[PDB]
Amino acid sequence: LKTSNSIKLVNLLSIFISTWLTAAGFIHLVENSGDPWENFQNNQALTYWECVYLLMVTMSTVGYGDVYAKTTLGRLFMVFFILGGLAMFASYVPEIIELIGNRKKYGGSYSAVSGRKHIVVCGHITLESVSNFLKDFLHKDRDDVNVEIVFLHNISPNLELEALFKRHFTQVEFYQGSVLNPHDLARVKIESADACLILANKYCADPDAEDASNIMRVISI
Amino acid sequence: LKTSNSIKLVNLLSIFISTWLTAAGFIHLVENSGDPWENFQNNQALTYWECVYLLMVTMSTVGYGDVYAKTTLGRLFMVFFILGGLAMFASYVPEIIELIGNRKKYGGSYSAVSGRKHIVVCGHITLESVSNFLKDFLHKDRDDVNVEIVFLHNISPNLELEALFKRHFTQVEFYQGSVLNPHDLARVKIESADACLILANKYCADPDAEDASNIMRVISIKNYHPKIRIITQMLQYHNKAHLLNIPSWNWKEGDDAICLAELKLGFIAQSCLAQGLSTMLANLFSMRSFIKIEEDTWQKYYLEGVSNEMYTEYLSSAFVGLSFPTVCELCFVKLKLLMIAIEYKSANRESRILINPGNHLKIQEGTLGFFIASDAKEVKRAFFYCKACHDVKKYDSTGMFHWCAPKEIEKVILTRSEAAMTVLSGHVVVCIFGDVSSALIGLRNLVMPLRASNFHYHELKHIVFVGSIEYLKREWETLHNFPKVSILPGTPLSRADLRAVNINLCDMCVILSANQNNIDDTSLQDKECILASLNIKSMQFDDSITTGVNIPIITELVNDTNVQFLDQDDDDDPDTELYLTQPFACGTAFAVSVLDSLMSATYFNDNILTLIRTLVTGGATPELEALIAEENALRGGYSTPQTLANRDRCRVAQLALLDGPFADLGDGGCYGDLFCKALKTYNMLCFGIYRLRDAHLSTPSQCTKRYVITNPPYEFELVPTDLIFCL
Amino acid sequence: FDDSITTGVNIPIITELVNDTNVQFLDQDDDDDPDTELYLTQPFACGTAFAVSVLDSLMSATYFNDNILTLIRTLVTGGATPELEALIAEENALRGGYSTPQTLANRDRCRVAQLALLDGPFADLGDGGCYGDLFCKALKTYNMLCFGIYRLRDAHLSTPSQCTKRYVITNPPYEFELVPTDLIFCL
């Protein structure tokens, strides 16, 4: 089918409408029925797609007198959807935020432009590790070879680091993922890159293992 | 009443209704009392059930204009009820926590279906310790016995692990609770289960405080039902002797505990004798997915040898009186089954297991036949074979090993110059990491199969522990009774150490790490072994590279994704699982996680974990394992001529088809001629070929990587580059 | 063990326990009921497990009598007087002395021991009689305050086995039958 933002959204949507559409499915049986102290005279001769347009409005806590709820069942059909959402709304919040939080936001491949030859700056990317690097690489006094920087790290950046990324909007791409995972090396196009610059954490605790960790990132490439 | 899932419903429905009815009485009296700017009159009598709709519309925050009820006092209590509703949701928003979290069965009981039986897999339940077990127990090539799996743990399951449980929904259950409660053993119903398995936390901090914890779970179960079969993973060897102390523990009934430092360091110790036995054996107890590759050549010959498994079946009455080499010929020529070992009934309480005996034995009625086959159907045809229609001196006191006088540590601490003096051709180098904070790998289990008394004293491989002395002095009180053991201090990352050991003239460079099994990551904890492997595979040597890359090494791995980094010829994305990769198929990378499929293979056939113990540890009779458990390391005897019959059971080695009386068959002859003539003349079992990767004509190179094929047919044309796994 | 199970389970062992609920693991021939609290278990009443939580009830007994802890500190710790505790207030160790006849006079207090009802002065009372008569014979003749019995678990006497797990009975009545295998707590 469609992308992974849509595939995971299938079972999240198919369960939601099924409880929703059934709730007005009891309105339609009672809208022909009416009050229990009557001769089974209908509440309204309207159809089912009328109430679809009305119960969805009352479910989002709106008045106006949408559904004519005269029946004692219709008096209690408004009780139905409240726990129908409350026993479900604790399961929608950490995913819709993840839906917009990863709308292939920092995922996605690299558009291998024929003009843009590119480098892959991986390793310990922080604010101070890159602010010294973008000054003396992306400098306007160079005879500017069409060389693009494609960062690659397993940690989503700070917005202050994105503030440096946003000002260099045309010469920086940041991606998620580490170079220890060979799916991410294809995503970042090592096969048509020029150089893969591995920055290092200068202020670690055990520098005999930190640069030994960099050799693992060397071997994986 | 019931528990707090029902008590808190009683706690709230008394709170809500007592105001829900009190609100219903407000409006009806307000419809009788009046309203001061409504001319002080109100004579309505809308009764109690109608007032809910007049007030929950004001409570659902909808406020419809369909309702005409616009009076002053009804606006006033709805101010008081919305301010009153906040006290209710101050308690009820906490009460949604015990509603969505207690909609699970995790705390309920198991419904014992009479039509089948179940097992209980408790202990240590994570993703990788369970996902590696469910694949090889709930396998589609299994004869689908309805044997359900009832997990039991005092930790709420990972939602990705629950996603694995949703895959296997028809068999797998989970239940909250420990195994140290006789009520939690009553919900899971181990009074009618068939087995109760114990997993282990292999990557723990203290392997003694974790392994003693697994014996408390053993004591707790056997109190509750002292007939149940249990299967336990251990982490050390020295403290699986505590399981003998439990009086219900009868290993003759199925209670077999799986040591992991005995089998890991035993499969590596057999690969120092014939390289590939760490993956020759580790394919013989896993239900491997028999996919068929067609175009390739080193993977097509391999995957026909990955679907072969050890099966047991009783010998028929026709074999009685026949010698062992006549039987294996009659099984391989006629039945097309390889038969590796028998179960000789010396006593019903003392029945030894015998791999490949000579002409000394004859088949008794009631000896069990250990076969190797691809199908459970074909192994039954041995029970239906008939001739009618189917046709001073220092060894151990036990005498299984070698033994010497106890030596001090400083007697064998070699320098770099001393190791350059002695010449060490064809030996075993062991690389050891760890300071003092690293837990003790059980290095007695590495040395003991290399000191089995099948070997003459001139044919013992010399063993050099290139490690650190503040680690290796901790190990040394278990090792100091063996011959020909040396220790060179200094890191195995250093080349000047490894040139002193003459690692070019080696037979196996075992790389072991004893460090913390969580240093930083799940992907950065093998950096000490990959850099020690890649160090040796780039060295230069004199001609007087000699092999350079072709030094045969073997490497344990904490993870399994790190198998990519050992060779530079891989084509491996990080979901090509561990048996298909080249460093595992060639026999140079033994991860521990291929022994997680052993306890699924032990449950279905009891004589599967005992067939590998004796093949792999060499000796390891329970009469000898008790004596090591008594006081100390081994003790010496004075070589009586019945303990010298404990020698020469079976040597395990490989040999070449380049010379000897087999090269006339080893150039173009069929493999089925080679197997029959070895038993007929020299009485050794040819159970596998160690095939070079480029024996197929593929632009002839210097790639000396040899892969392992298990039990090739009577067909299958040889190549003179081959090596044969013999006994 | 060999003279050259065979005296392997008859080794007397006492074990302190941190958790009370682990007490059923100490025996394999016990009823494994979980709700049976710590004094109703078998390895406690035999006297082979001493949990720490059994002293939590000593807070309650000390509020209602000052004189409980005044006694069971004397009975247990050799009779440590506050005159000695003032010497340990100076806190090195016990300080030595040269045994004056007042120093040596602090010996005639009561030792604690068990007595076997075999091959001695009490073989007459061993086969039958009552405990309340053994109490009078010990106290008059020997000044041994008999204090409680330590009876084998097979008191029904069908002689089925050789288990020696003896349980303890505090203050049995005057008319209480004895068997010749009991051990009596005395002073």
Side-chain angles (χ1 to χ4, degrees), chain B residues 613-627:
Chain B
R613 180 180 292 117
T614 61
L615 174 57
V616 171
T617 315
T621 61
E623 191 268 332
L624 176 59
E625 295 185 354
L627 292 172

PDB file of all heavy atoms in Angstrom, chain B residues 613-627:
ATOM      1  N   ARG B 613      27.662 -34.165  25.401  1.00  0.00           N
ATOM      2  CA  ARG B 613      28.560 -33.964  26.521  1.00  0.00           C
ATOM      3  C   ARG B 613      29.767 -34.874  26.410  1.00  0.00           C
ATOM      4  O   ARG B 613      30.901 -34.420  26.570  1.00  0.00           O
ATOM      5  CB  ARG B 613      27.850 -34.206  27.850  1.00  0.00           C
ATOM      6  CG  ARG B 613      28.755 -34.008  29.043  1.00  0.00           C
ATOM      7  CD  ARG B 613      28.079 -34.253  30.372  1.00  0.00           C
ATOM      8  NE  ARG B 613      27.070 -33.253  30.654  1.00  0.00           N
ATOM      9  CZ  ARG B 613      25.779 -33.522  30.783  1.00  0.00           C
ATOM     10  NH1 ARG B 613      25.344 -34.768  30.665  1.00  0.00           N
ATOM     11  NH2 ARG B 613      24.925 -32.543  31.047  1.00  0.00           N
ATOM     12  N   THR B 614      29.550 -36.149  26.104  1.00  0.00           N
ATOM     13  CA  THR B 614      30.662 -37.087  26.085  1.00  0.00           C
ATOM     14  C   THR B 614      31.517 -36.946  24.842  1.00  0.00           C
ATOM     15  O   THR B 614      32.727 -37.183  24.905  1.00  0.00           O
ATOM     16  CB  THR B 614      30.146 -38.509  26.187  1.00  0.00           C
ATOM     17  OG1 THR B 614      29.311 -38.783  25.060  1.00  0.00           O
ATOM     18  CG2 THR B 614      29.357 -38.659  27.465  1.00  0.00           C
ATOM     19  N   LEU B 615      30.912 -36.580  23.714  1.00  0.00           N
ATOM     20  CA  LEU B 615      31.678 -36.296  22.507  1.00  0.00           C
ATOM     21  C   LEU B 615      32.570 -35.082  22.680  1.00  0.00           C
ATOM     22  O   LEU B 615      33.670 -35.030  22.124  1.00  0.00           O
ATOM     23  CB  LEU B 615      30.719 -36.084  21.343  1.00  0.00           C
ATOM     24  CG  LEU B 615      31.226 -35.630  19.987  1.00  0.00           C
ATOM     25  CD1 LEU B 615      32.263 -36.583  19.467  1.00  0.00           C
ATOM     26  CD2 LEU B 615      30.045 -35.572  19.046  1.00  0.00           C
ATOM     27  N   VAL B 616      32.139 -34.123  23.482  1.00  0.00           N
ATOM     28  CA  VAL B 616      32.705 -32.790  23.487  1.00  0.00           C
ATOM     29  C   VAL B 616      33.633 -32.572  24.668  1.00  0.00           C
ATOM     30  O   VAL B 616      34.731 -32.042  24.512  1.00  0.00           O
ATOM     31  CB  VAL B 616      31.557 -31.764  23.452  1.00  0.00           C
ATOM     32  CG1 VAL B 616      32.057 -30.400  23.674  1.00  0.00           C
ATOM     33  CG2 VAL B 616      30.869 -31.854  22.113  1.00  0.00           C
ATOM     34  N   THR B 617      33.227 -32.996  25.860  1.00  0.00           N
ATOM     35  CA  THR B 617      34.116 -32.907  27.007  1.00  0.00           C
ATOM     36  C   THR B 617      35.149 -34.030  26.987  1.00  0.00           C
ATOM     37  O   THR B 617      36.176 -33.945  27.667  1.00  0.00           O
ATOM     38  CB  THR B 617      33.279 -32.923  28.288  1.00  0.00           C
ATOM     39  OG1 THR B 617      32.174 -32.037  28.120  1.00  0.00           O
ATOM     40  CG2 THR B 617      34.061 -32.399  29.476  1.00  0.00           C
ATOM     41  N   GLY B 618      34.930 -35.048  26.167  1.00  0.00           N
ATOM     42  CA  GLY B 618      35.853 -36.154  26.087  1.00  0.00           C
ATOM     43  C   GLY B 618      35.470 -37.241  27.058  1.00  0.00           C
ATOM     44  O   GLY B 618      34.975 -38.296  26.658  1.00  0.00           O
ATOM     45  N   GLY B 619      35.660 -36.973  28.341  1.00  0.00           N
ATOM     46  CA  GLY B 619      35.333 -37.937  29.362  1.00  0.00           C
ATOM     47  C   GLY B 619      33.989 -37.642  29.975  1.00  0.00           C
ATOM     48  O   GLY B 619      32.961 -38.041  29.420  1.00  0.00           O
ATOM     49  N   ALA B 620      34.008 -36.974  31.131  1.00  0.00           N
ATOM     50  CA  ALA B 620      32.827 -36.401  31.783  1.00  0.00           C
ATOM     51  C   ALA B 620      31.801 -37.469  32.154  1.00  0.00           C
ATOM     52  O   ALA B 620      30.596 -37.306  31.956  1.00  0.00           O
ATOM     53  CB  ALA B 620      32.188 -35.306  30.927  1.00  0.00           C
ATOM     54  N   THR B 621      32.295 -38.578  32.681  1.00  0.00           N
ATOM     55  CA  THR B 621      31.414 -39.502  33.361  1.00  0.00           C
ATOM     56  C   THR B 621      30.934 -38.862  34.659  1.00  0.00           C
ATOM     57  O   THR B 621      31.672 -38.098  35.285  1.00  0.00           O
ATOM     58  CB  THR B 621      32.138 -40.801  33.670  1.00  0.00           C
ATOM     59  OG1 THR B 621      33.245 -40.524  34.532  1.00  0.00           O
ATOM     60  CG2 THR B 621      32.655 -41.417  32.408  1.00  0.00           C
ATOM     61  N   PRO B 622      29.701 -39.153  35.086  1.00  0.00           N
ATOM     62  CA  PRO B 622      29.225 -38.617  36.371  1.00  0.00           C
ATOM     63  C   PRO B 622      29.984 -39.144  37.570  1.00  0.00           C
ATOM     64  O   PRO B 622      29.924 -38.530  38.640  1.00  0.00           O
ATOM     65  CB  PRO B 622      27.756 -39.049  36.407  1.00  0.00           C
ATOM     66  CG  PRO B 622      27.388 -39.239  34.983  1.00  0.00           C
ATOM     67  CD  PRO B 622      28.612 -39.788  34.327  1.00  0.00           C
ATOM     68  N   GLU B 623      30.698 -40.259  37.422  1.00  0.00           N
ATOM     69  CA  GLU B 623      31.586 -40.725  38.477  1.00  0.00           C
ATOM     70  C   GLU B 623      32.854 -39.878  38.550  1.00  0.00           C
ATOM     71  O   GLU B 623      33.470 -39.779  39.615  1.00  0.00           O
ATOM     72  CB  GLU B 623      31.896 -42.203  38.241  1.00  0.00           C
ATOM     73  CG  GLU B 623      32.583 -42.927  39.379  1.00  0.00           C
ATOM     74  CD  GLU B 623      34.085 -42.895  39.255  1.00  0.00           C
ATOM     75  OE1 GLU B 623      34.574 -42.813  38.109  1.00  0.00           O
ATOM     76  OE2 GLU B 623      34.776 -42.953  40.293  1.00  0.00           O
ATOM     77  N   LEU B 624      33.256 -39.259  37.440  1.00  0.00           N
ATOM     78  CA  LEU B 624      34.382 -38.331  37.480  1.00  0.00           C
ATOM     79  C   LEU B 624      33.933 -36.920  37.815  1.00  0.00           C
ATOM     80  O   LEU B 624      34.649 -36.190  38.510  1.00  0.00           O
ATOM     81  CB  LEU B 624      35.132 -38.344  36.149  1.00  0.00           C
ATOM     82  CG  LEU B 624      36.303 -37.370  35.960  1.00  0.00           C
ATOM     83  CD1 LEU B 624      37.394 -37.575  36.995  1.00  0.00           C
ATOM     84  CD2 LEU B 624      36.872 -37.500  34.565  1.00  0.00           C
ATOM     85  N   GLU B 625      32.752 -36.518  37.338  1.00  0.00           N
ATOM     86  CA  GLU B 625      32.247 -35.183  37.638  1.00  0.00           C
ATOM     87  C   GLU B 625      31.934 -35.025  39.117  1.00  0.00           C
ATOM     88  O   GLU B 625      31.997 -33.911  39.646  1.00  0.00           O
ATOM     89  CB  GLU B 625      30.998 -34.884  36.812  1.00  0.00           C
ATOM     90  CG  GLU B 625      31.231 -34.820  35.311  1.00  0.00           C
ATOM     91  CD  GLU B 625      29.985 -34.406  34.540  1.00  0.00           C
ATOM     92  OE1 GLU B 625      28.910 -34.286  35.163  1.00  0.00           O
ATOM     93  OE2 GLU B 625      30.082 -34.192  33.313  1.00  0.00           O
ATOM     94  N   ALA B 626      31.609 -36.122  39.798  1.00  0.00           N
ATOM     95  CA  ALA B 626      31.420 -36.068  41.240  1.00  0.00           C
ATOM     96  C   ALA B 626      32.736 -35.838  41.964  1.00  0.00           C
ATOM     97  O   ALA B 626      32.780 -35.110  42.958  1.00  0.00           O
ATOM     98  CB  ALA B 626      30.767 -37.357  41.729  1.00  0.00           C
ATOM     99  N   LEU B 627      33.818 -36.449  41.479  1.00  0.00           N
ATOM    100  CA  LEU B 627      35.101 -36.359  42.170  1.00  0.00           C
ATOM    101  C   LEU B 627      35.707 -34.971  42.046  1.00  0.00           C
ATOM    102  O   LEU B 627      36.400 -34.510  42.958  1.00  0.00           O
ATOM    103  CB  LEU B 627      36.060 -37.406  41.624  1.00  0.00           C
ATOM    104  CG  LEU B 627      35.654 -38.829  41.974  1.00  0.00           C
ATOM    105  CD1 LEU B 627      36.524 -39.830  41.252  1.00  0.00           C
ATOM    106  CD2 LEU B 627      35.769 -39.000  43.469  1.00  0.00           C
TER     107      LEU B 627
END
